[PDB]
Amino acid sequence: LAKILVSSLYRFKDVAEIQTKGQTILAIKLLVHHSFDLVIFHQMSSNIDQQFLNLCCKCFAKVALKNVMLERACDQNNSIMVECLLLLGAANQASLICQVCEKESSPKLVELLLNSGSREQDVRKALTISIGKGDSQIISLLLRRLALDVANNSICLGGFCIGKVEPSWLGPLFPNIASTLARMVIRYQYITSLDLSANELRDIDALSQKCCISVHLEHLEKLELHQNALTSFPQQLCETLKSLTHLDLHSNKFTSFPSYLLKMSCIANLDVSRNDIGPSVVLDPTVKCPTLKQFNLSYNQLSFVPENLTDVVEKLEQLILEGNKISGICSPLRLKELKILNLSKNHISSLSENFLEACPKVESFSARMNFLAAMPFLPPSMTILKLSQNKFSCIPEAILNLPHLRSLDMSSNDIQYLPGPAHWKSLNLRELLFSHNQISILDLSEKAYLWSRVEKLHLSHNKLKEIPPEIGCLENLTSLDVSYNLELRSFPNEMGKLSKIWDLPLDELHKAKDIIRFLQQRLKKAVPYNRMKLMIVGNTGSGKTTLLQQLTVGIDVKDWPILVLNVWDFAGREEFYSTHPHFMTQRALYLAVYDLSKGQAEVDAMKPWLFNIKARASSSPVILVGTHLDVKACMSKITKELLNKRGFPAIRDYHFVNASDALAKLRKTIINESLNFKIRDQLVVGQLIPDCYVELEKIILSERKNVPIEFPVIDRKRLLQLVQLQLDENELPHAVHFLNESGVLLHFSDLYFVEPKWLCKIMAQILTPKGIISRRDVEKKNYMSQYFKLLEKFQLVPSSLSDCENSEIIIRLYEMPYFPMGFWSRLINRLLEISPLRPNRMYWRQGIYLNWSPEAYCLVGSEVLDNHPESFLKITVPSCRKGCILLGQVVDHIDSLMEEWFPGLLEIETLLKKWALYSFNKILLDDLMKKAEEGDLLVNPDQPRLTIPISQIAPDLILADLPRNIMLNNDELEFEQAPEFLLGDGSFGSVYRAAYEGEEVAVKIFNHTSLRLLRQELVVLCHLHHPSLISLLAAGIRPRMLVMELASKGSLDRLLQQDKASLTRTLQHRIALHVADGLRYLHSAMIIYRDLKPHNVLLFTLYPNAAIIAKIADYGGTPGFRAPEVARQQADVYSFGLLLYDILTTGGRIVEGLKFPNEFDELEIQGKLPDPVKEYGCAPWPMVEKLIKQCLKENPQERPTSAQVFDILNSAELVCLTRRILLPKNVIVECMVASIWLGGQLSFLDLRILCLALIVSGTQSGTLLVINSVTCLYCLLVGTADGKLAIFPLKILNIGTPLMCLSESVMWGGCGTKIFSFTIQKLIETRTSQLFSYAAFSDSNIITVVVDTALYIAKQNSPVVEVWDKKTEKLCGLIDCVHFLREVSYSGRVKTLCLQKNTALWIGTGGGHILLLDLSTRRLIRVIYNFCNSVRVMMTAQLKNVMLVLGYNREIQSCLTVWDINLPHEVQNLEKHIEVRKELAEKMR
Amino acid sequence: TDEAGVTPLHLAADSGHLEIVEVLLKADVNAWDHYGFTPLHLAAHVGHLEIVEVLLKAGADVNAQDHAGWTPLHLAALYGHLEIVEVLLKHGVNAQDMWGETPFDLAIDNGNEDIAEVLQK
């Protein structure tokens, strides 16, 4: 514009008032562009005159764009611009704090940017920048806002990697003019725990001898130096502080034990878990400190044992030596207080007889993975013993002799005979694991009554023979692990007596209440089962019904008694061919038809029928039958040569029946084959089933005649109306499942289809461009509702539907001998979902070819190669990344369909060769061979100079659908499957820790898994970025592992069980809020979790007001964390409620599996929960105690959404309220005092009288009684109805006109409509305020006044509060409460005022609204709505600092409530933290 | 009006200036503000007769309800203005606000027993 003027003000900085005319600036943008900020700053800092200051500020108001004004101002370190601009708004935006820290500056500026709001990551970056530069002031204030916890009285310091620590850094950590300018411009407009986890401290010698904080830290009582790099800890420091009793310095690099650290005053929980102390750790003698409780001296070079404990320590409860190098036989160990000791992973051959026969209270001896063969006389005090994975040949007799054994796990042992309970002598057995062992007998009939309390018995991977029903005498059993036996194949009916079992591991050995109830029914009544399925099969129309007549549309189900077998006359017309695999059950025996009149042609043409039979029911014998012998019998030659058991199903017989004569032989052979079936050696034509099933079958058969002929489909209650048998709720599902397996009725879901002939004649009646049709329902009224769902899902009509540079595309083949029966009509139905907008897809009977663009297409066809007898599908897809994703997804769908519908095909030739074609410049390649060639990432032929990347040709094998950023580098990762490098177990595998381009990045190693489940897990885990989600870094294929981030402070279960005192009232809510946010994101992504529990929630930092505190771990149920009906969608919310219940409880629902394991599941079936506060004694916490009750509703349709529960958790009222005490109905109270006392009668409460003081009383008659019209009291002051006073009657200074308020903060008060102060000092008239607001408010009684820098006046029945200056003695102004109310029934009449030292005033309206205000900025914080209907009295009480609120729930119900003193600060903190979290979530993508 | 929302005749009625309210009437008789207060409500609060009966004769609502559901009868009973109470009574007693108290109840809490007898019969 004009730089001449700015050049003039450049000189005008020191010039006279001539600069005032420069007025002309505000008379008329880019004014501040060059130097305007600096000139105005010399102006207002030039010994500041008010006349010029006002015009300068008026000109400056045009600037308020605002951010860039600060950015130019923030360039030069200057507190006045800092404070003024922060008051005007505009600090963590660009950053700015980092550059101010980098530039030389003063503490005041950085303190302003810190306390005005700054992103945690930016503050950490600025701190790391400033660490290198020598400084002791700016970093000191940075720590104040970065890592200080006054609420917990502790100073954490974790992830922020500081180079070293020095005493001057933690100085203050251990315990104006701008406002005037801003206001007028606006008008114109003892530490306990110290954490040093991740700070790579090479040494700690800095603050060792004597410093500023050495005396301050002398009573620290908790110090953390873990994960550090310490060595040779200085003995000077341990003498320096004489109160430390929680020091845990592990993962450091030590050489020899200090032995002077134990010379500490009173130290406990000394933990060195990874320090490499030398071979000998013998403690120095002559030091008797009886304070150590837990001693984790683990993972060391200790060939011997610490043979110093017996002489020195007297209370070494948890003396642990797990994983040491302990080789020799241990000393007699004369300690007399050892409670829990571990010797796992040591090298121990045996123990001496006196090795353990010294401690009288060893209760938890355990030595896992040791070469142990004998166990020398454990003292009787032991209760839990873990001796798994040892060289045990038989259970040592000493174990049989201890009286009070509770839990014993001797897994991974090679013993032969386990002793009977008549030798155990212990009736309190709880858990007994004996997996990985060679046990053949389970003799218990000797004495079973001794075993009554056994809960979890494990015998997996054992060569058992049979289960004796005597084990049914066991009652408290909960989990019987009998899987992998492969030798039992039976179940004694007495198992039904064990109703307490909720899990059963049956895998490869041949749930919960269903199996046990079935066994109970069989025990009550068992009858032989005589019903089999005989599915006759034909080809294009032949002697099918004629053969049945001697012995077509749909399947024509018929019953044929002889046992009884039902004949299913399947269809011959190819059009009906789509639905047939739905009825080819595994337990049946199929016929066939030759029609020998056609000779050699027909037997080969009918081969696909046997192919389909082999694919569906491989273990089903077949009876081949000719049906045209009347009219060339050489077909027997090919039947014996090629059609035999070579590749096609297990043919058992073939006949040449005429149509008579050979029918007798046919019938005899059918009976012989059906009787001798032996499906997996079971003879299932004569199996045993409960008579309840047979009675139900008879009931259904009888009801078949008595049913609507047109629609014989009965309702869900129609089964109930039939029953007079005895079947409970759980019997019906398994019963109908068995009946459906027996071919009596169909049920897949509120309707039961009886008379399957009608269903299979009508549901397939629809069969009788081309292939597409719209709604054209004819023949047969409310049927369509389920008819469309049944028809579309089972059978647009897919059936009968219209029968290139070679390097940029990828092709795959899945060659099969023939296409299975219902293959395409289901594959094309499944491939209507795949996507990275509706694509275009011209799909014919055997193809799809769905595409969005030339860069996104997928073509699945029906390839017919030259000189190729069998048919196969070819799939083509462009070699782009999106194409690779599509290929992976579609091939996953293909193999899922194959494994879920034709198990016979993919059963180890294998009849399914998955070819992958490639071309260096096409060449066949087996997918199995390609998978085997995973040792490298490049495939090359015998000729070496040419090669192809693996991902280019097999994108499904090596991760290419996933982002290329998820690609682990073997040289970086160090994932070793060690038994301590793991962090926990979960779902389909476990998680470990390893170094990978970082500190300790976790690795999820997979267990038996497959690259088909791996694909799904990777695809769900990736492409999902959220602050509450545990994001993964990389993936590898060599272990086939994942890489994840670290929960720095552990998992929530460990937090609850170990450190229950570290959970603050703001920490529990923060964890709940973040878990709710993660669940909200999961639901918004349409993914269920059903896994919420303390074991699954991970904590990062224990700093309350952080940005990331809790996250939700792996997500694809639990006895203690069960869903309402799914585990015993909206089911996630109920699991969330259980998580909230325990967090509120702090370890009640958990730690309830040891005294009553099933009690965490056996009382929450339908809305039954104990009251948490009374049940567990935890601190009361309403408005979330009601939230859990209102969220975990029994009706899933009544439970709120995850977004709604997150929103309700996002409220400081839920965080600040601590009590809500009710009062008896129809009782009114008008006054309370500082237990709590209330108001001719009197009321009292523990957590007509007018007003009371503390003990004083007084009623409408103003009774001057002496106990231990009065209108106001204080504490001694008394006010009457016509302006009197009392200094008791020491003095009565009459001023009246009733006195009604007296306050102190020289006291102040009110009388009528006039304020006094004191001997009356200043009686300022207040009625003269009618120019603002109504005159009626000014001319009214004054109810309450509070004393501060200003004076706040509240008058009765007024919606406006007045402010009068204390010194100026003039009306400073009015604050209109209704204006706040209108922004948000509302009354607005002020009833009481309360003042807080942080310049926050809380005003109680007549209605149920509490207005928060800030005196510094005169801005509303919020309105406390929904609270009550009235508010009468508020006053601060030092319980914790909290001020109560009284109200009526008008029907009259008076209520009391307690709010935290930090309500506005908490509101600001929560509002800042939610915004920061939202910004982080936005930035994650 | 003003930023909060009120008309000058409201101030005139509350301050009891007869000439000003009369000359302004010669605006809205039932003008309601952001509080919902009526000029009749303010006149009853101040208890200043002639504006009360003039506004009642001018067409002011007999049972106008403010934000707090208080009638001018309620305010007159509350502040001890019995004369306003009967003046409104012959202009046409069971009306309840959200809290649900008649002017009888207001007289009861404030002790205006003189207004209490008038309201019952």
Ligand SMILES: C[C@@H]1CN(c2cc(-c3n[nH]c4ccc(OC5(C)CC5)cc34)ncn2)C[C@H](C)O1
């Ligand atoms: C105290 C110790 C415990 N720790 C952890 C870490 C984790 C953890 N991190 N990342 C994970 C990713 C997945 C994960 O899936 C679970 C919940 C299935 C185990 C756990 C973690 N879970 C417990 N504890 C980390 C170390 C340093 O500290």
Ligand SMILES: Nc1nc2c(ncn2[C@@H]2O[C@H](COP(=O)(O)OP(=O)(O)O)[C@@H](O)[C@H]2O)c(=O)[nH]1
């Ligand atoms: N000549 C002769 N014809 C037969 C014989 N068995 C069946 N058919 C013919 O097959 C027809 C019956 O077909 P059907 O069994 O209902 O069909 P499908 O079982 O579904 O294949 C009749 O019309 C007969 O003419 C036979 O033994 N000899």
